[PDB]
Amino acid sequence: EKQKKSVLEKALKRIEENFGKGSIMILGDETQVQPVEVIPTGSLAIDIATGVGGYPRGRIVEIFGQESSGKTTLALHAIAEAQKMGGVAAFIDAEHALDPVYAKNLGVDLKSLLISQPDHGEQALEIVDELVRSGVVDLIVVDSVAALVPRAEIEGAMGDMQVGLQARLMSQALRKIAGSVNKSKAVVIFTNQIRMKIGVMFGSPETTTGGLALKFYATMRMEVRRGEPIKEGKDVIGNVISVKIVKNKVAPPFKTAQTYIIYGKGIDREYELFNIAVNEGIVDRKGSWYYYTTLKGEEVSLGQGSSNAVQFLKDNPEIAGEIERRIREKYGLLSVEKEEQR
């Protein structure tokens, strides 16, 4: 039996070591998996689904979905997390749609955010490559792929004989970026659409032709979908989202995270934490009242109903932290270099 697996595992290793880490995996192998350096996503559910607890440094990630799916909110959290760790984030903007007020409330430090609003696709991708190469930037969000229009097309020259030269030019710029990110501490995230293709009408594959290179250059690809409304009494206060990791080269793919966007706040860390804790049986419910037992044995009353329990978590960071660590440990994420005393 085990001899069957050790020959198996050994062969898997051989192939994997032949073609690069993550080249082949056992889909059920959350063993452990092995931590790599990541920037957390801002969602505990997504962190779990990635298998490594976040976006891996030195890699490209694609986040795609319809307009208004929640991909914008994910990208803003990625920025916020990169800043929170003490890093520097850049936003390469071809949409011109940022809501600075939402971004700030969600947790982005607007003052320190680097911003570029490039003239065209090639320039955008060259700026990204230089930023990666500079060594000074932790996380770059590129929004978005579709908007990434070739110079010539913009100047309306399409043209002289070759219409698809840029396709190659873009794929080439991307290849440069892939080259540079491997030697860097940077995470590079591209957001991409499945909605409203440009310039006119009906659709080719949702993700764009630069996207093919993206499809293959990316270490993770995440498909975001808007789910059911969330209501507090008779007000809708947000909606559920699902985030399916359709490609993952550092842990097993095809995990789907369910998480929650609260309007005006983003993926509220305490709201998500409460729901996950409750789903995991770590916080329990006695009638309408919620309770938690600390590791040290204290049984603590979180309050009556979800809204009170979520606020309690906000008012009691030390308890929230413990509940979160327990969840992360359970799924093998806890960094574990964490030191206790302060």
* Secondary structure element (H or E) that encloses residue 11, with its range: helix 2-19
Question: Is there a contact between 64 and 74 (Cβ–Cβ < 8 Å)?
Answer: no
25-267: CATH, from 3.30.499.10, 3.30.360.10, 3.40.50.970, 3.40.50.300:
3.40.50.300
For CA atoms 221, 39, 143, 269, give the dihedral sign.
positive
Q: How far is CA 280 from CA 52, 56, 103, 138, 270, in A?
A: 19, 26, 30, 33, 15
Say how far apart CA 64 and CA 171 lie, in whole Å: 18
Say how far apart CA 107 and CA 105 lie, in whole Å: 5
Q: Is the peptide bond before 144 cis (omega within 30 degrees of 0)?
A: yes
Bridge partners of 189? Answer: 61, 141
Q: Which conformational region is residue 315 in: left (phi greater than 0), alpha (psi within -120 to 50 degrees), or beta?
A: alpha
Residue with tokens 């009494």: 233
Integer-rounded Cα radius of gyration of the chain? 22
Question: Is there a contact between 218 and 192 (Cβ–Cβ < 8 Å)?
Answer: no
Q: Is 72 a known ligand-binding residue?
A: yes
235: helix, strand or coil? strand
Question: Is there a contact between 41 and 245 (Cβ–Cβ < 8 Å)?
Answer: no
Question: Is there a contact between 125 and 172 (Cβ–Cβ < 8 Å)?
Answer: no
| Nearest-10 Cα torsion for 99, 103, 105, 108 | -150
CATH number of 268-342: 3.30.250.10
> How many CA atoms does the CB half-sphere of 7 hold within 13 Å?
4
Beta strands in the chain (DSSP E): 38-39, 55-56, 59-65, 89-93, 114-116, 139-143, 187-193, 220-232, 235-248, 256-262, 284-286, 289-293, 299-304
Q: What is the DSSP letter of 244?
A: E
Residue with tokens 């452990």: 32
Tokens of 319: 């308890």
136: helix, strand or coil? coil
Say how far apart CA 335 and CA 317 lie, in whole Å: 19
Say how far apart CA 182 and CA 38 lie, in whole Å: 14
Question: Is there a contact between 245 and 49 (Cβ–Cβ < 8 Å)?
Answer: yes
Question: Is there a contact between 95 and 144 (Cβ–Cβ < 8 Å)?
Answer: yes
Q: Is 2 a known ligand-binding residue?
A: no
Say how far apart CA 200 and CA 61 lie, in whole Å: 27
Say how far apart CA 39 and CA 54 lie, in whole Å: 5
Domains of the chain, residue spans: 25-267, 268-342
Residue ranges in 158-265 assigned as alpha helix (H):
165-182, 210-217
Say how far apart CA 195 and CA 342 lie, in whole Å: 49
Q: Listing from the earlier edge strand, what are the strands of the sheet with 284-286? A: 284-286, 289-293, 299-304
Bridge partners of 188? Answer: 60, 140
Residue ranges in 55-120 assigned as alpha helix (H):
71-84, 100-106
Q: Is 67 a known ligand-binding residue?
A: yes
Say how far apart CA 332 and CA 46 lie, in whole Å: 14
Resolution of the determined structure in angstroms stands at: 2.0
Q: Is 68 a known ligand-binding residue?
A: yes
Residues with Cβ < 8 Å from 93, sequence gap 6 or more?
115, 116, 117, 143
Q: Which of 54, 39, 45, 50 is nearest to 240 (CA)?
A: 45
Question: Is there a contact between 222 and 246 (Cβ–Cβ < 8 Å)?
Answer: yes
Q: Which of 206, 229, 217 is nearest to 65 (CA)?
A: 206
